[PDB]
């Protein structure tokens, strides 16, 4: 069973925004998604120093990213902390709301969307170059779902019965037509060099 539920809207409005203008500087999408994988995977190591069982659901913590012409996919999978229902549903946009308020503040004043990062919400520049976004995640205390928006003011959640994951979140790009680009290895490669070759974990670029 598959529930629906709308974005905020002051959400909904920061993904639009995001769609809507003209901002050639897209690659930036990469970078904060592997940060945001970052701090999952330094949350759950943090959080395993003081429950060592926290890691039965897998030791090893790292970032792959996996391109899939055929699907025109892009994926960024992380072994972190992972999100529960209540993230999902609730408490990722309640924290959200606040950041989207700052950020598009900022932007006028003269601020870009490269640095949607500074403001805890650069998870939906995703839409610079996706059409549709998956999210599947699965946390220690909560069961695996799939989340899934186009934008247009809603997303839904429902259990996910593919191939269980352990611990950690995808997030699944479905590219936009005109932005298969990202799923060239020398262009990954190129992206990842230039804003996230200190991240502290290591991240595997999949080959096609
Ligand atoms: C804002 C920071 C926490 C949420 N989060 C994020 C950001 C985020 C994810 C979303 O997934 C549907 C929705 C909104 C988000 O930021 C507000 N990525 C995570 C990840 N890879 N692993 C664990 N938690 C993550």
Do not use: C
């Amino acid at each position: 069973e598959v529930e629906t539920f709308a974005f905020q809207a002051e959400i909904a409005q920061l993904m639009s925004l995001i769609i809507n203008t003209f901002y050639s500087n897209k690659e930036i999408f990469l970078r904060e998604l592997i940060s945001n994988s970052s701090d999952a995977l330094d949350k759950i190591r943090y959080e395993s120093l003081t429950d060592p069982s926290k890691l039965d659901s897998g030791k090893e913590l790292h970032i792959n990213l996996i391109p899939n012409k055929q699907d025109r996919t892009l994926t960024i999978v992380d072994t972190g902390i992972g999100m529960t229902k209540a993230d999902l549903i609730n408490n990722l946009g309640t924290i959200a709301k606040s950041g989207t308020k700052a950020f598009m503040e900022a932007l006028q004043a003269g601020a870009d969307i490269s640095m949607i990062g500074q403001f805890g919400v650069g998870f939906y520049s995703a839409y610079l170059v996706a059409e549709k976004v998956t999210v599947i995640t699965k946390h220690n205390d909560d069961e695996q779902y799939a989340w899934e928006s186009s934008a247009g003011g809603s997303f839904t959640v429902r259990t996910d019965t593919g191939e269980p994951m352990g611990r950690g979140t995808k997030v699944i790009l479905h590219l936009k037509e005109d932005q298969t680009e990202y799923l060239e290895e020398r262009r990954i490669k190129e992206i990842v060099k230039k804003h996230s070759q200190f991240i502290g974990y290591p991240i595997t670029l999949f080959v096609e």
